[PDB]
Design a protein around this ligand. Structure first.
Ligand code: CU
Ligand code: CU
Ligand code: NA
Ligand code: NA
Ligand code: NA
Ligand code: NA
Lengths: 720, 718
């Protein structure tokens, strides 16, 4: 039973290359690199031969394979990239069966209602000491698997915990005053309410729009202004910004400016329409998908690993050179990198118990009615894991990547498999080191980094996060922003028009009648580092110039001021990239008697201007509610319920329940389990080069071993 | 007939055999060749080639015609390199012109017998004629000229020669200038140390039983207004010493507190300085792998089997919308010239010339062996000359093309540097992406074209990357690796008595070895002609301002914009939260904004950043080298202003570089500007960098700012 090779392999997602001269197919998918010649009775998988009962058949310039070829070859076992897990790792995300089970358990309570949605359903993390003992000592974890089930009953939040091992409900706790995140049905529900509104349709009509049905809405959280926005605190509201759909596939380029509808989600209707002056909708077609463009010729470039990968993925555990870590997915914050150790000549040393995105904010700077409340808390308010964007193979990640699928719960409690959710790829990153001693043979080696990449898209923005494992012990965390700008419709076509100056007070004129409103992107990473153990202290080293007191001709020297930062409050600080901040283990030293440490660099560079803080006066509410915006480094005592820089329920919050809260009591950071939070952002002033689609802009952070090792870590195994 | 593997590998090509397919894949630079044994044809970059003689298999080895390499690799089907029929006027002096220039000055009666040559370089034609050659194909109507800079003992003479008419045009002694360090100075110094009894006497005290195992290293001495005890007319170098213990790494064996001062015209030691005796650290600390075994690793290749997207026509490189010229200088290395971006058919100017301007690695330790220590690597040592050949596959990716480059050595003999510069395209993530909910994805891949050069001066190794983004951005990145300059000390660990004193000025990185703190400060000279040469420098400072428009916001995000009108004001600290543009006030994009490039002297780094010079403002080095203390400079274009540290910085007594060039504070309003970017690190050492330092990087960036009218990579309209 034959089938067409090319089409079948495409649909399966493999790259297919035919070489007419060699009469050879090269097939690539993930860890598998395959060669097969027509009519041969063996194929080659990752350097290894594989018998085929049925050879690839060529007929009138067209190849056919049996209908088991794909299984026979790709799933053969000669691709050793993925191996099966002997014992389930206690941090493995909830499975589909577990998700479904947690949903049946809460549904078995008399309180559940058919309207009830699920904001998040997630493994309730077992305790940290036991997870480490499993990872390093292989001790089983005897506490039962549990799940947190956070439910939205209309507008009310209930937190339920379930015990999955015993199929029982353990708790059911209403959470007073909390608003829940925006869920996928809210989007449809907002578009509908607008569509059924005669008022809104009339509002839209006096603004030029002739077919209201062509109006695309989008939902935003409203924030909190202690009543100045004229909106009651206890109702579930979203505001709604509108665009005209013109057929160019880019409604974002056709704002209907100065029209905002406020929607009550429980009443399912528009409770308020704010209207400002009428600004003609920008109408010119501005497609970003290529439809109006020539595709030039590019010569091929391929990164190939024809004997397979250097990493192994066992269940969710990834092993690579001296690294080992566990990689799992959460609907709110995306990827979670756990139990990170570095194998030092046989002994696994702890580096990081858990790293992930903490949260992020994208606040705007324009005071007008369509803008003044605008601040996306992408992970907290919209669920970034849920909104993961599948990796476009070979483009969003390099041709030598392996692409993992991940499973989370959707908002109605049903398992949802996200295809191509995370990319894993090894990459050449220049020379690791080099020395060309004059007159001698050179010495160079290559640097390899292992990257874990995840992309999440929220409305018009697309965010890329890379977790970068350097062979030498360094860890990089880089965030990339691309997508389509939020723009303001204005009257000016050029800076020569009479409204230009007023139109561009809060952003740049990037197209006719279009202004890229100025805003910030502020990312924060929650890094629970256990530098060769949990008992750590925070140390400062500030390079300084000191008068020379040692004699000789110099008036000055270069010296260091070294001091411990002994509490959370002093640890909350700006980052001066001219200084050194360490997380040290005061109980373990390297061979020179120096405390083993990691150097924490929240700002290692970026391609947009850098945000030195929040661009908000200190008396703005958004400033008040979100203290993480204003410092680049925080350190707090470990605590399993403190995970979000912006707080657990940030929608319409009135005070800081995040890093402000976690550090308010100013506890001791002396020789104890610490969690490091790095804030890094950009201040984005727009330019025409970014319209209609924005070229990816990057910021870089770094964690470097500092006297953690005794010598150059990549030198190699000692031969004597 | 000749054997394939031996012949191919002596030619520099990589040979792979695939037994399943019975196919050879041969790769060198831009050639990607496939050949089957017995086949009448082969493939070169995707294209068929008839062979006179098939590859034949004898005793399981392959044999090729004696003519194979030439027939296959030089067939014309690798189109990476094209012939240049009309030579660009910034083309570096050729080997013949180097020899010709040397004959011309040697013919003069003023040329003294053992004169050396610090630099023999193209004296280029005027900027305007060079642009008109590149943009309109107008011939420059000037003869080929060369600057010839000579060192007669310790005396500098600048001559100019006309190579076409083969005549000397000028001969000019340069008063008070000291010459850079030349290769023969290294051996001279080592010989003089070796023949000094006083020195063997000093060394012996310090615990050294065979004085023949002592390795010298020459350093320039700086300037201290006599406080160093050193005469200003004398051509001097100081000498720091290490012990060779056979580990291939003398750097790991300092003889601390012993400095000799050598006068190179007397050929003798004129001062020994001796401080406390510190035992020489002895433990073998090889960095070359002699004591190691690397772990086995699966192969990775980056392949371009139809060849490259760039074409290299002489030294002119074409790649996508970029065109530029690449040449080599013996002092500063690579020069990237007449750069333009092809905007939908029209070549627009971006950069007339960019290169390393100069750099400095100044130390912070006051002791006898350290206080004067400051390497000006290009200016004092000659980084082009000390170019380190790229190790194929390692110093650059497997898909690179490695260029050879020619300069003059210090005796005036042409010197061809193999694999002096690497060019390679690389994948750099998605160029842009938007995944609209429930719609088909849109993604394209970013490609960067990198030009990579490595120079090594004593213990360090510097990597420079000139990075062309398809979207109009240009990055310049600098990497540092090599071996740390260490101080020998008594302490073994931070628990010993001397540890605290021993580490006042640096980290303890091994037993008895402190990595003294210093800085790396690179400066880049960028004659940007933003869509023309008449430009102005514009600031845009994002600020928070009170809300005056109504509604609940108390504050708004606005910009303060103002021109920076003169050189002194343009010489500034860079706040990475602000924006600085070189704008063309005469030309605007479709929205009426002046076409501009955004200048970012600090786009990041893996080592701590220097806010400026880690020196009190009364230090001599601070006074001599203003360029260290500001990150941005902009000066009026001037043909003889090229070096941030000045033309002759050896024992300079004042600032003849950027301090001098901005001295009169001229106008920068709508005129030809030259932008200089200083970026630096402060290096506090750690054990992880010993015995060899993992490469650390700093990044800088030039981004188009309203230069174009839209996303520049969307492509041409249908
Ligand atoms: Cu942005
Ligand atoms: Cu250094
Ligand atoms: Na706390
Ligand atoms: Na911790
Ligand atoms: Na000037
Ligand atoms: Na210029």
């Amino acid at each position: 039973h034959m089938v067409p090779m090319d089409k079948t392999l495409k649909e399966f997602g493999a790259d297919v290359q035919w070489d007419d001269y060699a009469q050879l197919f090269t097939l690539i998918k993930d860890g598998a690199y395959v060669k097969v010649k027509p009519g041969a009775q063996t194929a080659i998988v990752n350097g290894q031969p594989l018998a085929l009962q049925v050879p690839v058949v060529m007929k009138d310039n067209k190849a056919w394979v049996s209908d088991t070829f794909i299984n026979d070859v790709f799933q053969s076992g000669l691709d050793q990239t993925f191996q099966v897990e002997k014992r389930p790792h206690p941090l493995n995300a909830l499975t589909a069966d577990e998700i479904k089970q947690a949903v049946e358990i809460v549904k078995a309570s008399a309180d559940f209602k058919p309207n009830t949605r699920f904001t998040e359903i997630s493994l309730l993390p077992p305790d940290k000491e036991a997870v480490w003992a499993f990872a390093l000592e292989n001790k089983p974890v005897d506490q039962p698997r549990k799940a947190d089930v956070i439910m939205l009953d209309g507008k009310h939040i209930i937190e339920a915990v379930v015990d999955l091992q015993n199929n029982k409900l353990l708790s059911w706790q209403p959470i007073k005053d909390a608003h829940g995140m925006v869920l996928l049905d809210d989007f449809a529900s907002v578009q509908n309410i607008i569509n059924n509104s005669e008022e809104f349709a009339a509002a839209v009509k006096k603004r030029g729009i002739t077919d209201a049905k062509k109006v695309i809405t989008t939902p935003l959280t409203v924030g909190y202004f202690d009543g100045k926005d004229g909106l009651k605190q206890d109702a579930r509201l979203l505001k709604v910004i509108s665009y005209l759909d013109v057929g160019d596939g880019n409604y974002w380029a056709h704002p209907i400016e100065n029209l905002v509808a406020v929607v009550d989600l429980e009443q399912k209707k528009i409770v308020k329409i704010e209207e400002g002056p009428v600004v003609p909708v920008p109408m010119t077609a501005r497609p970003f998908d290529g439809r109006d463009r020539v595709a030039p010729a590019v010569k091929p470039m391929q990164i190939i690993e024809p004997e397979g990968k250097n990493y192994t993925i066992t269940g969710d555990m990834i092993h690579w050179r001296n690294w080992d870590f566990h990689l799992s997915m959460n609907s709110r914050v995306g990827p979670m990198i756990s139990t990170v150790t570095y194998n030092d000549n046989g002994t696994k040393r702890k580096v990081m118990y858990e790293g992930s995105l903490g949260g992020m904010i994208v606040p705007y700077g324009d005071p007008d009615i369509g803008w003044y409340f605008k601040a996306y808390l992408d992970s907290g308010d919209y669920g970034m894991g849920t909104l993961t964007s599948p990796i476009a193979r070979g483009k969003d990640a390099p041709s030598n990547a392996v692409l993992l699928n991940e499973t989370i719960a959707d908002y109605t409690g049903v398992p949802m498999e996200i295809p191509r959710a995370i990319a894993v790829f090894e990459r050449y990153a220049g020379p690791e080191y080099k020395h060309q001693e004059m007159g001698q043979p050179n010495v160079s080696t290559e640097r390899r980094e292992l990257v874990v990449r995840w992309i999440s898209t929220v409305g018009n923005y697309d965010y890329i996060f890379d977790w970068i494992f350097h062979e030498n012990g360094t860890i990089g965390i880089d965030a990339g922003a691309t997508g389509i700008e939020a723009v303001k419709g204005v009257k000016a076509k050029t800076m020569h028009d009479e409204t230009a100056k007023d139109d561009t007070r809060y952003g740049t004129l990037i197209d006719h009648n279009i202004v890229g409103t100025t805003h910030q992107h502020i990312y924060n990473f929650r890094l629970d580092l256990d530098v060769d153990g949990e008992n750590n202290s925070l140390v400062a080293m500030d390079p300084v110039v000191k008068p020379n007191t040692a004699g000789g001709p110099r008036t000055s020297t270069m010296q260091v001021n070294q001091y411990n930062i002994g509490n959370e409050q002093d640890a909350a600080q700006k980052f001066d990239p001219g200084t050194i901040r360490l997380l040290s283990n005061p109980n373990k030293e390297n061979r020179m008697g120096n405390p083993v440490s990691y150097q924490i660099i929240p700002y290692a560079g970026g391609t947009h201007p850098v945000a030195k803080g929040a661009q908000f006066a200190p008396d703005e509410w958004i400033y008040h509610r979100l203290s993480f915006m204003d410092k680049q480094l925080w350190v707090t005592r470990y605590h399993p319920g403190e995970r979000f820089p912006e707080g657990k329920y940030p929608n319409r919050s009135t005070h800081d329940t995040g890093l402000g809260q976690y550090s308010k009591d100013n506890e001791s950071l002396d020789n104890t389990d610490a969690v490091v939070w790095m804030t890094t952002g950009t201040t984005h002033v727009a330019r025409a080069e970014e319209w209609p689609i924005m070229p990816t802009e990057w910021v870089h952070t770094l964690l470097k071993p500092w006297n953690f090792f005794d010598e150059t870590p990549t030198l190699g195994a000692l031969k004597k």
